[PDB]
Amino acid sequence: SGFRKMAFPSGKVEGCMVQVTCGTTTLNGLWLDDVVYCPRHVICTSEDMLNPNYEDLLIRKSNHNFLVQAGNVQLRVIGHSMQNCVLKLKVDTANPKTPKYKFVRIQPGQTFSVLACYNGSPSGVYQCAMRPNFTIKGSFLNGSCGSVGFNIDYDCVSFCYMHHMELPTGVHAGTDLEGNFYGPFVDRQTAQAAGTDTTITVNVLAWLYAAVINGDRWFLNRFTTTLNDFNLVAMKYNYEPLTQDHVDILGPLSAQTGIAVLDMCASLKELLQNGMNGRTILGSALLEDEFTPFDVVRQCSGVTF
Amino acid sequence: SGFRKMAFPSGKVEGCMVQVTCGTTTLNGLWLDDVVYCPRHVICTSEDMLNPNYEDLLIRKSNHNFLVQAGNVQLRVIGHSMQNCVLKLKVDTANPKTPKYKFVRIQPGQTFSVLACYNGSPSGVYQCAMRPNFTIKGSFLNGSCGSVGFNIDYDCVSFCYMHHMELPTGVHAGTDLEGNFYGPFVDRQTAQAAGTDTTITVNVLAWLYAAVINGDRWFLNRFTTTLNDFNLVAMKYNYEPLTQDHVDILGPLSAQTGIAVLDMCASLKELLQNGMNGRTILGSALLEDEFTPFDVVRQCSGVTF
Ligand SMILES: O=C1CCN(Cc2cc(Cl)cs2)C(=O)N1Cc1ccc[nH]c1=O
Ligand SMILES: O=C1CCN(Cc2cc(Cl)cs2)C(=O)N1Cc1ccc[nH]c1=O
């Protein structure tokens, strides 16, 4: 019993973090097989960051301009390339600790664990979500660039996120492991519009199911609703529209609690139109949307890796 | 910027988790050097759990009754003893992955990371606090017994918690690594009084400092107060009394934000007597007491391990 923001165990990722140094800049890299992946703005001085010509700047750099440290084992770089917004350093040594892994582009609303890192050394781990507007609300200080987000299925690490940027608004932006930014962002020191966010409806409902599994049942009502009627409520409260796909994803939680999906939408409706009255659900006084239905099932059933 | 419940990276602990099997029971153990530590109720059948005679039950067990699995490496048990509420299995093999480590008894209000585990395999990691009443509010399912809580300073793992028990109230109880329960609890299937909890005042204030560091400044008032006057407010709202020790611990955050401790107590006072008005502080609509001042300094300054 109980429900926490739980991250994946990070050991498999810890053995892949290295320090990457080019000119005056240092940030984190990810060392898998004989390749290190890091944000391409490692090649920039602070002057370059207003409008960098990455091609032109990369041309001035050779293999020996890149220092990769893995603890103390200084790796030797024997090849370099830019793929979108990441740099790929070919090193003479495959990582003895390389896990089975996949590069993935996650979808808005999916969650992952972040291993926040500084000078190639892990600092802490926490869970969060790709927002509908393709930002993440993280905890990242200067030097955390190249920290990665990930999921773990059994023994397989799916890397989905590399940190590039704090927006002047205090939220975070970054790329998949191919170097393509999530969202409209670019790797320049400029103000950049995130655009309107929404709340991840299917995740709130899954959290409502988690609450019922743990004995928090007070928001369970006697009303029901329809998908379209609820979607009327969702649009007004800046919630994502709920589709039959979402209803199917929630089927297993529906069945384990015996509360139909549309019935639990009827409770969410009341919570939206009437608030919480200063009560709490699973210890929070707000509706939480950073648990996917899988996150809930994994925690209330106990899946290991 | 940003502030999250952040756990320590768990890799050092992951390499120590093993499965421990005695009779019909299986739970997690912690393998350091040539000794495995696990809850002593591994030797109990479900009948025994109402009022077990642990001495008498342990007498019926020999070295070969204990199966320790570390992945697949079945370790061989060559010695066994009970220390308080833990069992210590002497195994023929020192753990190649033993980290530098200490056993510690933490104090109420201190925090630690839990690596929740099932059948000796890690499931997820999260942060929490030893409550004033010596329970923890965790996420633990059946089979999570023997999961451990810990802190990490540089390269040193301080183990502070081993999970034994979910109370019929849905909260969690357990021992230090010497086998002594935190709190009044015992390892029997009986209803057990946790006793009145309180809120950890010095932790709320540290979180208030974290909020000011991240730009959430709206609760900053123009009033001040005195330690005794504030303590009047604390006692009424079931907050722990604030002492000069706590004020000294907060000195570094006071200095970095330039807000005197007693001034920030004056804001906490207003928040307690008047609530939040449906606004939020660092994304929460409640006062958060599971960040120590060190937790805050480590996150808003970026300490690594
Ligand atoms: O480390 C750095 C260095 C430079 N820089 C600025 C730009 C990077 C990109 Cl690409 C375009 S502009 C940045 O954003 N970070 C991340 C970061 C900084 C402060 C608090 N939290 C953070 O995550
Ligand atoms: O795994 C077990 C097995 C038996 N058992 C009952 C007693 C143990 C002690 Cl000592 C005295 S009575 C227990 O409490 N757990 C932990 C647990 C169970 C269900 C949800 N969450 C949990 O943590």
Numbering used by the authors:
A (entry chain A), B (entry chain A): 1 to 305
What does the primary publication say about this deposited structure?
To inform further optimization of this scaffold, the x-ray crystal structure of the low-micromolar inhibitor AVI-3318 in complex with MPro was determined to 1.96 Å resolution. The docking pose of the inhibitor closely superposed with its experimental structure, with a root mean square deviation of 0.45 Å. With only minor discrepancies between the orientation of the chlorine substituent on the thiophene ring, all major interactions predicted by docking were confirmed in the crystal structure—the pyridinone side chain bound within the S1 pocket and in hydrogen-bonding contact with His163, the hydrophobic chlorothiophene group occupying the S2 pocket. Fortified by the correspondence between the docking poses and the structure of the AVI-3318-MPro complex, we sought to expand the SAR beyond commercially available compounds, which were limited to substitutions of the dihydrouracil nitrogen atoms. By introducing side chains at the remaining two positions of the dihydrouracil core, we envisaged engaging the S1′ pocket to further improve potency.
Proteolytic processing of the SARS-CoV-2 polyprotein is essential for viral replication and depends on the action of nsp5 (1, 2), which encodes the main protease (MPro), also referred to as 3C-like protease (3CLPro). MPro is a clinically validated target for SARS-CoV-2, with the MPro inhibitors nirmatrelvir and ensitrelvir used clinically to treat COVID-19. Starting with a lead-like dihydrouracil chemotype identified in a large-library docking campaign, we improved MPro inhibition >1000-fold by engaging additional MPro subsites and using a latent electrophile to engage Cys145. Herein, we describe the discovery of uracil-based, nonpeptidic MPro inhibitors exemplified by the advanced lead molecule AVI-4516.
